[PDB]
């Protein structure tokens, strides 16, 4: 299988660039030059790169340095044909953000966090980025009495509303994507799941400019079904971006290669994004890999792992396609009545009164007889895995 720009695979500079300094040890790899990252990624088949302001320009660089770095980065994209579909801001690393950016209890930190972001929005706009991703990693708490969640939500909203105002006024045309995470690094992070993030966005001033950027491992950290969660994000039309990676349930954030965690869910996810209505994908944005090359690898291991992500996604797509094209699958789908859920429960123009008058919907209904027919779901599931396994 081969990756095309139409596949839209993107990588964050902080992914292949992760030096592997974890909570219990020192870095095992040297620093990756952004320019080299651009050439390597272009080479393995990626169509775009993303970055945190501090990933490209070292926190605290003068404008001379800053400017110089942007210029070279810009050349590299130029020469390679890579685009920057999204940019983000680092509101978690520096000690000042120890209690959050936008929701720090310290008012001065909150004003500073907004400024840091406006600036990144400027660069984003100049590089042609269309989405600003906001990961509130430090927004939350370790102790219940330390954070007033209501006030917190008011301040998160306040900051976001200003950001959309600016973008709209400067005409940047950006879309905002809130990234939910349940915990790590805070004991508990605000807006813990795709559901909480979606509900919150619905309360902003210009909600149409906001969506979510859910990450595979983030929902799996709470043992939730990532595919089902994405399906709901799609139903709401808030899937603005997506971070793909692997995780093995509730434990620290693993950030494994996509499909190296819950493989069955990785399969159902590709199927959902790709086998959309009418052949066409159900999702159109970047297929972004927010993962980390294991601490035990060297740069060889690093590039290997970058390609494994693309590879996993294309192998899965291929099997998802074959699955759906299989007449035996088509027959099992029919037997399990999966498409019957698409037919409205009520007849055309039928209301409460017509339903109340329908004796077959209750008075004359044989629940015991209907309760005994099987749905044939194990069989359909078995067909799916055989396709995944390449046994069909």
């Amino acid at each position: 299988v081969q990756a095309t720009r139409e596949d839209k695979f993107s990588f964050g500079l902080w992914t292949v660039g992760w030096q592997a300094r974890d909570a219990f040890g020192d870095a095992t790899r040297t620093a990756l030059d952004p320019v080299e990252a651009v050439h390597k990624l272009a080479e393995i088949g990626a169509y775009g790169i993303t970055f945190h302001d501090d990933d490209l320009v070292p926190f605290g660089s003068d404008a001379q340095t800053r400017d110089g770095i942007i210029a070279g980065f810009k050349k590299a994209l130029d020469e390679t044909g890579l685009i920057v579909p999204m940019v983000t801001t680092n509101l978690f690393t520096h000690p000042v953000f120890k209690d959050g950016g936008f929701t720090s209890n310290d008012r001065s930190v909150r004003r500073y966090a907004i400024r840091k972001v406006l600036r990144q929005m400027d660069l984003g706009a100049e590089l042609g980025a269309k989405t600003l991703v906001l990961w509130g990693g430090r927004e939350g708490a370790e102790y219940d009495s330390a954070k007033d969640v209501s006030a917190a939500l008011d301040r998160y909203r306040e900051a976001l509303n200003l950001l959309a105002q600016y973008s709209e006024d400067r005409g940047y045309g950006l879309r905002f994507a809130i990234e939910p995470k349940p915990n790590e690094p805070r004991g508990d992070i605000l807006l813990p799941t795709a559901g909480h993030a979606i509900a919150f966005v619905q309360e902003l001033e210009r909600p149409e400019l906001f969506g979510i950027n859910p990450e595979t491992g983030h929902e799996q950290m709470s043992n939730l079904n990532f595919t089902q969660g994405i399906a709901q994000a799609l139903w709401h039309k808030k899937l603005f971006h997506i971070d793909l990676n692997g995780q093995h349930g509730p434990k620290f954030d693993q950030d494994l290669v996509f499909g190296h965690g819950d493989l069955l869910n990785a399969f159902s996810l590709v199927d959902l994004l790709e086998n959309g209505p009418d052949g066409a994908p159900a999702y159109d944005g970047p297929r972004h890999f927010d993962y980390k090359p294991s601490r035990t690898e060297d740069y060889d291991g690093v590039w290997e792992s970058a390609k494994a992500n693309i590879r996993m996604y294309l192998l899965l797509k291929e099997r998802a396609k074959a699955f759906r094209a299989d007449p035996e699958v088509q027959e099992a789908l029919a037997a399990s009545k999966v498409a019957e859920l698409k037919t409205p429960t009520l007849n055309p123009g039928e209301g409460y009164a017509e339903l109340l008058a329908d004796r077959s919907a209750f008075e004359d209904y044989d629940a015991d007889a209907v309760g005994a027919k099987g749905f044939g779901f194990v069989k359909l599931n078995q067909l799916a895995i055989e396709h995944l396994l390449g046994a069909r």
Copy 2:
């Protein structure tokens, strides 16, 4: 401390009435008579009782029978002074609901599911109930290819829009509270967390009529912070009802007495609900205990466990109040800047243009200096714990 009608403790008929038949064993208790339950609940301090249709009137009772039970039931209510704040429908027990009620792949079960609920709405209306709780326990799947999540949400919405229509035409004045649960009985249930339920509700035709009924244990089954999710629900103004109980993290649904599982989170929850805005509670609805007397107990144990629920709440309330009234806590709160979060990040009339002009919010900001001061959150947490243990 003793319970008042003002405390608003309510219990489901099915809590104290649970025969303790579990997934691996026979019932260890005999059936509890409803008139009896009303009488015993009235005696321990409950102000109201709730029930699923099938808890009161056995599935399939002829009208004479059904009519007879209701009459007896109403008389018990009458005599004890107990009310029916909420009613619900059993859409999970009968085999016909094995793939869901509103979102079953089978269209006829969907139609019957609506009829069974309309009928319950009429009785609830008749008893004076103000809330209809909907727990979609059979909505979800075991395998991803078995359920079209999108179609399932359309059908969940189609059914609720109809229920609101009927309630409104008829003048019943009901409020609808959706109850989220991540799993059990289904592998994965649709609308798994408080967030997912709130996001969904915002998409119905008359959203103002819809809220959620979150359960302590359900959020804990995903290892989420229950108090923090209630804080967000209150922020959205969607906390229409609450189900209190205890649980020990992610494992089957335990349904312990409130406060017998995560005690620290039980404490922060009572503080949130009672030490509200003015001085006044932040939540005014029923404090409903959705628990189960452990299988190892007889009826003395059942009545002991019912009183334990009320005792845990009043004991926690008492300490929450004491916590907030302590000068040392006030001092700790001031050092942690909890209240500073309530002050807008921006000065009145300040926008991005003024923020951008403030050199001190960025260009001259000493982030290193700010990042070095502590928040003193451990100390605040320790004071809270000492109040809970009655150590101060």
Copy 3:
């Protein structure tokens, strides 16, 4: 592929016979006749059947009735050529066992539990069973003060020593396998993981007669690595039996078909068992499926699901074989140094004296240079999954 008797696939009478009454609903299937179950299993390729005393002979059957059932059973066995490799006793269903069998706080229940088991050993011995599995599903607690664990382990050991005694005296030649489970039905079950069971077994009077019967989902309920725990059980030589099924991390006991939960862990499990040292399997007992046909299925889904367990094992087996015979996989193994772990760390005859004397082990050790070499683990993982996917 097709299963052979050499495959040693067995099923418990209670798996295909599960009537699907869960914690929230009635049964969706009628009862399966044991003779019929014998015939059907034989037909799908099983080599044996197992059962709890109460699965075959209804609790409280008079001796004439019990004798009759046993006789018809034996005939079916005879006629089909199926064997009974293991038997077990139900010490969890009847209300009497609500606080456990061997470890109930009530002395009389402990005496009756032992008699119930002795009677099953007789029947097992007569059907030719070689293993007696002990699943103490009710041994545990919901509250810490309710159970003295130390006393409980003493009582557990007391019962198990008597059982070995009787067996050895009767010349039954049985081996005992304790089956660990973390929770469900008790809040916390004693001997929660394979580890705890092994450590306990080591304290019996005749440890050589005791091992464990670990179950895939049971270890996954604690989010532990099943294959890795199995590897350790094999190092201790205590894998007497195994229960294969599927689970999705920490939540109620799902009992899915083997391979329908954690697919990647199912794959590495089959690699461990069959591609043992010296060509041959590392384990030679029954491959027992302790699963449940989903509640959504009828008898067709039931047989479908029994066959899916066998297909799943055979497909993974084929892929594990191909994986290991791949010269590229071999080269990756060499590069990752997997086999180098099998070489003693100390040289032959080397002791601490010589090690202390070797300056290349410390004094002249270049930690920094070794620390920089990659192990190539990601690439190895990628070939593994490419084999499972049938992409190689």
Copy 4:
């Protein structure tokens, strides 16, 4: 209350010295001077201090330096009266240990790891330490095909056997305590639970010299009942040491103050360790706090947090004693038959022959009447909690 040296509260140098560099951000605190630490801890009530080789002497310190540091360290101990009850070695930080120390695939690393430990054993012996704690934080894997678990256990055994040998020959008199942890930093760590660790120890050459050092948060990361695990560890006589802290279930290793995570389980643990048989504590070793002052804190929060660990243990101790001394508790314990578990199931001199001859244990036993009586566990639990809240 006040801490005495008989309480035996000890702390690791890395606890109060944690600079708060997490997986996502920089250190928020400057480095702690070891002499100061000795002084500070002496002041809050600690009776001893512990450390990893590398906590005290910077990795790669010349002999001169090393010697220099130790000498100052011994002075501080001298001056203050603190002892070093236990010592440990860092086999997780330096990049060379990325695949483990003792079970690294790389043989040269295994040799180096051994050397590094020998050296710390010497320093330990010289400082008067009685226990060597071994935490194999890097022992495990991220991918199943990368680690032969059996060979890894062989190599782990091989290294421990040698250490015992050396200690015995040098006459050091050390006991060794293996510390289990399920994950972090490796995806899966070898010897994931107290269970697994005990089973392993039993396979060593001089098992009487080995035990375990379970940590509260480690067992809670897999959602196990810490108290029950320590009860088993005491049953086996393998509780050589204990690490006390707090955790909020399955998520990253939090390291909160003891009792700041699962408060009810911290209560039952204190009760188990102190309200041992013959009035006396069931455990007589160090009560060691392996925790971390939250990243949001400064040095004041650091000493605050140190004192909190002591305050929590002593407040809990005080309630555990009141609980056991309460007559109504005594009445509840009797009704729950907690002590009847201590009376052997069989009468003195009874074996299977006499048990078989007892019609009352089976043939004439009324399981139904026994099964109808409740154990009063809920009431007993409620009394325990009211004692903890200081409500009784």
